[PDB]
C-alpha cells in the first residue's frame, strides 16, 4: 500500500506529520526543489501537514479539510483503484491531403508455380481495397486479409 | 492412422498466403468460366447478393454440364452459355432437385472434412470461419493426401486390400468426340475417362481438367472433335504393387487417379485419391 | 531511505521521454534497478495516458538479452513506477565519446546485438522510433541494451504512422519530411547511423546549419572515410537509402556478408488502389459525402480527409464498418483509399459496400 509524499519548494529542513504516524515529524529527503517520502498507508482517509523550515503548512495544490477548530490539514483518500496499474490508468483516462505512402503501391497478385499461392504482404497494405479496370461492364475487386497467422486475398467478380 | 485426422484442425492445412476467387451469382456464366481460367483456379464460391450468403460453388462439372446439356452443333452458337447468368443456370440444373452449400470450419478436424467429402460426394470443400463468415480456402483431396504422405514416417497388394472401382469402368476411344465423352461424365458422375486404341490397350486419359482447355483456348464451340485431337495441346499401376508405393506414385506426380492395368497395358480397374482417403476413414 | 518495492531510490540516472529515471538498491540483496517515475497528473496533462498503457503492456511480456527488461510496474495514487534492469556501462554514446570509434570486429558485435533487439521489437509489432547511441546502454560485459520506448508505437494491420519523433541526426528522410511511414524502415535508417557512429566515431549526417543537415539527410549523401571496409560501405549505402522501397529490410541485413561474419547463434492484369479523381480535394470530400448519404450510410468526419462509415445490413441485420482516406499521388492527381474495419462474409460485405460508391465516382 505505498503512498508518495512530495514537497515542491525549497528548505533547509522539511517534515511530514500525519494521522498515519500519530503526527510525528518524519523527515523528507531533498533531491532538487522536491522533498519526498514514500510510505505504506491503509486504504482510507488520512490527514497530514508539513513542517517546512520552522513553519506548519499544507500543500495548497492538494485537497484540504478545515476543522471545527479552524485547523487546516491536507486530506488523502487512498482508493483501491490507486494500487493496480491498469485500474489506475483506466480511472486516469477520464489542412492539406497526406502524401500517398509508396507501400500501398506494392501488391502481391502481380509480382511454373502454384496460381493459388501468393507472397506474404506487408501488414500495412492489408484490409485495403484494390480494383481492376471495369472491362465488359463487370467490376473486379480485391483485398488481402489475415485470419490468425495466415493470409487470404479475396477476388470478387461483381457485375455493374 | 484415422486418429491423426480426428485430431488435426483444418486451419493447419491452409497455406501461409493464398488467393480466393468469388463470383456473384448475377455474373454472366461465360465470364465466370474464363475468370476460373485466368486466375488459374479449379473452383470458386458463389455469393448471392440478394440472400447475403454463399449459396454454392462453381466448378468444371458446371461447364461440362452446360456444354453437354446445351451443345447443338459446331455451326451454331451455344447461345445459353454465351448469354446466361450463373443464377439463371443454377435454377435450370437444380430445379426441384435442390442441393445446399457444404462447408467446413478451420477449427473443425481434418477427419470431419474427409468424411464430409465422401458424405456429399464432392472434390472441392470450402473452409469458412464462423464469426467472420469469410471463405478462407478450398480444401482438396490432393492437399489432404499431400499432408498425410509428408506425415507417414496396409503394406499389402492392391488386389488383396481391394480399394476402388474395378467393375464397369467408364471409357472412351481414340476417335470418340468430346461431346460424346462429356455425356459420359454427365450420366456416370466420374472425373476422368481412359482413352483406348484399336485394341483393349490404354493410350491416354481425358480428365475434367482437360475440359477447361476448351474454355482457355475458346474452342468449346466445336465438341465434334475426337478426344485425341482435343488432347493434342500436351501413368498406370499394377494389382501386385503395394498400397504404400501406390500412395507414393500418386503424390510423386500429384495426380487424382491411377489405372490398374494388365500385362499387355489393358485396363482392369481404377483407384482414385477419393477411395484411398476413404479406406483411411 | 526512500523505498519502493524494497529498493532504496537513489540518484537520478537521466530523464527520459515521460519522466525521471533513478537507481534502486535492494534493502537486503543490494541488487540495482532503474526506476522510471511517471506522475499520474503529468501523464494526463499530455494525452499520453493511452500510450503508457500500451508501453507497459508490451515491455511487460518482452524478454530479449539486448532490450532493457521491465520487472514490475508499481502504482501509487500520485505517480507510477516502472522497475527495470540496471546496466553499469551507461550510454553507448558516452563510450564512443571517451574511447574513439570501435574496431571493425567490436562494431560488428554491437551492431549484431542492436539489430537483434530491433528485429525482436518488429517481430512483436512494436517500433521503437528514436533509436540513438544515447538510448543504447551498455553493461559491465559490453552488451547493447535498447531503452527509451517512450517514443515507441504499435504496428496495426493496414495502418501507417505519422509522428515525426526522434533526434534530427538519427531521423529518417520521411520522418523529417513529416510524411507517412510503415514503421520498420525508420528504425533501419537509425540502425544505419548507429552503425556509422560505431565504425567512424562521428555522425554521418551532421551540420550546425540545420538546413544543410536536412538537405544532406534527404539527399542521403554522407562521407565514407578511407579506413571503412567496402563491405560495410555497401551495407551502409543499402541501409541509408532515401527511398524506403529501396532501403534494406532486417532480412536484407541478415543476408549481408559483413553482418553474417562471426554472427552468434543466440541472436535470431493491372491492379489499382482505390479511385483517382483529379478534382479539388475540398470538392472530392464534398462529392464523397454527397455519394455516401445518397446510399443511406451513417458516418463520422475525423480529419477533413479521413471518414469512418457504417452500413446496416438489410438481411443479416449486422452493422459493417469501413474507413475512407484521401491521399495525394501527383501534383496533378489525388486518390481515395478504402480500408476494412473488423452472419454473411465480412470481406464480401466490404467489397459490396465499396463497389456501390465507385459505380457513382471518378477514375
Ligand atoms: N461445397 C459445395 N456445395 C454445393 N455444391 C457444390 C459444392 N462443391 C461442389 N458443388 C457442386 O458439385 C458438382 C460437382 O463438382 P466437383 O466434383 O467438385 O467438380 P471438380 O471435379 O471439377 O472438382 C457441381 O455441380 C458443383 O456445383
Ligand atoms: O521529479 C519528479 O518530477 C517526480 C515526480 N514524481 C516523483 C516522485 C518521487 Cl518519489 C520523486 C523522487 C524520488 C526519489 C528521490 C530521491 O533521489 C531518493 C532520495 C531523494 C527524489 C524524488 C520524484 C518525482
Ligand atoms: N473412369 C472411371 N470409370 C469408372 N469409375 C471410375 C472412373 N474414374 C473414377 N471412378 C470411380 O468413381 C469414384 C469417384 O472418383 P473420382 O471422381 O475420380 O474422385 C471412385 O469410386 C472411383 O473409383
Ligand atoms: N492416371 C493418369 N495417368 C496420367 N495422367 C493422368 C492420370 N489421371 C489424370 N492425369 C492427368 O492429370 C490432369 C488432370 O488432373 P486431375 O483431374 O486433377 O487429376 C490431366 O492432364 C490428365 O492427363
Ligand atoms: Cl538524460
Ligand atoms: Cl553502490
Ligand atoms: Cl552490469
Ligand atoms: Cl558519437
mmCIF file of N, CA and C and ligand atoms in Angstrom, chain C residues 92-94 96-97 100 133-134 170 197-198 200-203, ligand 8:
data_model
loop_
_atom_site.group_PDB
_atom_site.id
_atom_site.type_symbol
_atom_site.label_atom_id
_atom_site.label_comp_id
_atom_site.label_asym_id
_atom_site.label_seq_id
_atom_site.Cartn_x
_atom_site.Cartn_y
_atom_site.Cartn_z
ATOM 1 N N UNK C 92 25.976 4.253 -24.775
ATOM 2 C CA UNK C 92 26.908 3.784 -25.795
ATOM 3 C C UNK C 92 27.540 5.053 -26.339
ATOM 4 N N UNK C 93 26.737 6.137 -26.412
ATOM 5 C CA UNK C 93 27.165 7.452 -26.846
ATOM 6 C C UNK C 93 28.387 7.877 -26.049
ATOM 7 N N UNK C 94 28.287 7.967 -24.710
ATOM 8 C CA UNK C 94 29.450 8.332 -23.889
ATOM 9 C C UNK C 94 30.651 7.416 -24.132
ATOM 10 N N UNK C 96 31.576 5.910 -26.958
ATOM 11 C CA UNK C 96 32.136 6.360 -28.230
ATOM 12 C C UNK C 96 32.744 7.777 -28.084
ATOM 13 N N UNK C 97 32.381 8.540 -27.040
ATOM 14 C CA UNK C 97 32.961 9.862 -26.799
ATOM 15 C C UNK C 97 34.324 9.725 -26.162
ATOM 16 N N UNK C 100 37.462 6.055 -28.906
ATOM 17 C CA UNK C 100 37.117 6.596 -30.213
ATOM 18 C C UNK C 100 36.025 5.811 -30.891
ATOM 19 N N UNK C 133 22.581 6.158 -30.124
ATOM 20 C CA UNK C 133 23.533 5.563 -29.158
ATOM 21 C C UNK C 133 23.365 6.088 -27.730
ATOM 22 N N UNK C 134 22.653 7.210 -27.587
ATOM 23 C CA UNK C 134 22.276 7.818 -26.321
ATOM 24 C C UNK C 134 21.234 6.890 -25.625
ATOM 25 N N UNK C 170 19.482 11.249 -36.424
ATOM 26 C CA UNK C 170 19.085 9.845 -36.491
ATOM 27 C C UNK C 170 17.769 9.644 -37.223
ATOM 28 N N UNK C 197 28.247 5.552 -36.608
ATOM 29 C CA UNK C 197 28.783 6.069 -35.364
ATOM 30 C C UNK C 197 29.732 5.065 -34.698
ATOM 31 N N UNK C 198 29.382 3.769 -34.726
ATOM 32 C CA UNK C 198 30.211 2.720 -34.147
ATOM 33 C C UNK C 198 31.522 2.566 -34.908
ATOM 34 N N UNK C 200 33.024 4.824 -37.259
ATOM 35 C CA UNK C 200 33.722 6.081 -37.531
ATOM 36 C C UNK C 200 33.933 6.971 -36.343
ATOM 37 N N UNK C 201 33.121 6.780 -35.306
ATOM 38 C CA UNK C 201 33.185 7.593 -34.097
ATOM 39 C C UNK C 201 32.566 8.970 -34.251
ATOM 40 N N UNK C 202 31.918 9.254 -35.419
ATOM 41 C CA UNK C 202 31.235 10.525 -35.730
ATOM 42 C C UNK C 202 29.834 10.263 -36.302
ATOM 43 N N UNK C 203 29.073 11.335 -36.601
ATOM 44 C CA UNK C 203 27.745 11.195 -37.194
ATOM 45 C C UNK C 203 27.825 11.302 -38.711
HETATM 46 CL CL1 LIG D 8 29.023 9.844 -31.458
#
